[PDB]
Amino acid sequence: VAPLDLVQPISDYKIYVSENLQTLVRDTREFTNAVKAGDVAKAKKLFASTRMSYERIEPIAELFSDLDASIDSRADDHEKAEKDPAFFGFHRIEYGLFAQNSAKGLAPVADKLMADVLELQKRIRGLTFPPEKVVGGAAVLMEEVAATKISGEEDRYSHTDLWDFQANFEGAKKIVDLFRPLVVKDNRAFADKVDANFDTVFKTLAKYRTADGGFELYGKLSERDRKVLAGRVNTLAEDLSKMRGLLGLDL
Amino acid sequence: VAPLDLVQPISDYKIYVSENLQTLVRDTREFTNAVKAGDVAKAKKLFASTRMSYERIEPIAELFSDLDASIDSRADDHEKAEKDPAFFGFHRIEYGLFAQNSAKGLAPVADKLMADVLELQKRIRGLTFPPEKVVGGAAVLMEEVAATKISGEEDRYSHTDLWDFQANFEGAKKIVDLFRPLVVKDNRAFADKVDANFDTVFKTLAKYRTADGGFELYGKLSERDRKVLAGRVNTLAEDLSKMRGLLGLDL
Incomplete structure (x- = not known):
């Protein structure tokens, strides 16, 4: 595996992240002004959809730790939970729109979210991506999905976790797809296994679609379902880790 | 497994974390004093040993994400690498001590490291530990060890990564030990599997001990060894993830 063969999947991946960041800015813009307009109903329907692009690009969340916490931290990440006035980002807006059914005082929160998403796009715009990252x-x-998100920690008020899971998997599959030509050279069997493992997980989530094609609220997933999902997602984590090694990225 | 049965193990875990925090505070004071005194050689000798307590309590790092960044971020997490003004903590000092062989300009970095560590101890004391966390x-x-730390990203200048790994494994093993009385009731086979898997990992690291009982610098680990280590460590992640579900923590 020559390192030069890595440049082109990475350049392709940055384009993928860039376009998703474009969607996020656009969607966050339509999301925030709706919150600032006081329309709770419209903003609630835009919550998961706006966050889709963010959840897709979270495989590189380590490269923006500061922003990730400002944008996507949960109440349990703060000493005084929901009440904490230093609790900003999506899940603070989420608490307002879904738990208390009101957009009260979310104006500075929405503007902060906008600035952060803009700073995120800017930061990543000038960021080179190490393939190992x-x-x-x-x-x-x-x-993280299997071991920290599996009880519905991410969306404790909207319970739209399945949308986020789907986006996370999609974001990880993109990475798998891009690096496949390199992997399949000396590890075709493993490459096919990784594809099959993602297919298994996507199909598992597909069970929880609704009649109109949406997702069920995460509370509908039984304990046995969650434990089964976690195990299959762990296989994905295992695959990607082995994939790093096979790409020679351990040096 | 009833949620009440989890209360005492968590209480014993916080004691464990608190004790390591006490060690961390003492060690950091000795370490930062050496740095501020301009004793490069002495500070270098205390680098890994001071960080031991911190690496032990990293399973709950998400409960102090801001501080974890201030204390332990690496150069490649920032846009301008080693010279980024936002680059503080252990690895900012590590660069000066090991790469530059100088304590120049590290005194304010050492002060901040102390303040953050002290703030870390305070934050955790008034913190409730959710067993799922x-x-x-x-x-x-x-x-993270298997997929991100495996090429020696953590200690790029001192290459003391094996010391950290050992500490990470002990920290995770303590959690395993604490919940074993609960798991082994209806999952004895699994409990012994986990113990065996950790034994495999510890024994793997034991290969890279030196004559006087120290550890090899991480550059000594071949690519092959790193890939094998990652695989065995991935099993630990899957064990712990599965253990969470077995403890009834997916609800």
Whole structure:
């Protein structure tokens, strides 16, 4: 595996991240002004959809730790939970729109979210992507889904976790797809296994679609379902970690 | 497994974390004093040993994400690498001590490191430990070791990564030990599997001990050894992730 063969998947990945960041800015803009307009109903329907682009690019969340916490921290990440006035980002807006059914005082929160998402796009715009951060970061994200998100920690008020899970998996599959030509050269069997493992997980999530094609609220997933999902997602984390090694990225 | 059965193990875990925090505070004071005194050689000798207590309590790192960044961020997490003004903590000092062999300009960095460590101890004292954070966070730490730390990213200048790894594994093992009385009731086979898997990892690291009982610098680990280590460590993440579900923590 020549390191030069890595440049082109990475350049392709940055384009993928860039376009998703474009969607996020656009969507966050439509999301915030809706919150600032006081329309709770419209903003609630835009919550998961806006966050989709963010959840897709989280395999490189390590490269913007500061922003990730400002944008996507949960209440349990703060000493005084929801009440904490230093609690900003999506899940603070989420608490307002979904738990208390009101947009009260979310104006500075929405503007902060906008600025952060803009700073995020800018930061990543001038960021070069180490392939080990991309592949390795994808592995960690999968483990985070299975081991830290599996009870619905991410969306405790909207319970739209399945949308986020789907986006996380999509974001990780993109990385797998891009690096496949390199992997399949000396590890075709493993490459096919990784694809099959993602197919298994996507199909698992597909069970929880609704009649109109949406997702069920995460509370509908039983304990047995969650434990099964976590195990299959762990396989994805395992795959991506081994993939890093096979790409020669351990040096 | 009833949620009440989790109360005492968590209480014993916080004691464990608190004790390591006490050690960390004492060690950091000795370490930072050497740095401010301009004793490069002495500070270098205390680098890994001071960081031991910190690396032990990293399974709950998400419960102090801001401080974790201030204390332990690496150069490649910032846009302008080593010279980035936002680059503080252990690895900012590590660069001066090991790469530049100088304590020049490290005194204010040493002051901040002390303040942050002290703030870390304070934050954790008034913090409640959710058992899902402890077990799930341990699983993530393991994946982080296997998928992100595996090429020696953590200690790029001192290459004392094996010391950190050993500490990470002990920290995760403590969590395993604490919940074993609960797991082994209806999952004895699994409990012994986890113990065996950790034994495999510890024994792997034992290979890289030196004559006087120290550790090899991380550059000594071949690519092959790193890939094998990652695989075995991934098993630990899957164990811990599965353990979370077995403890009833997916609800």
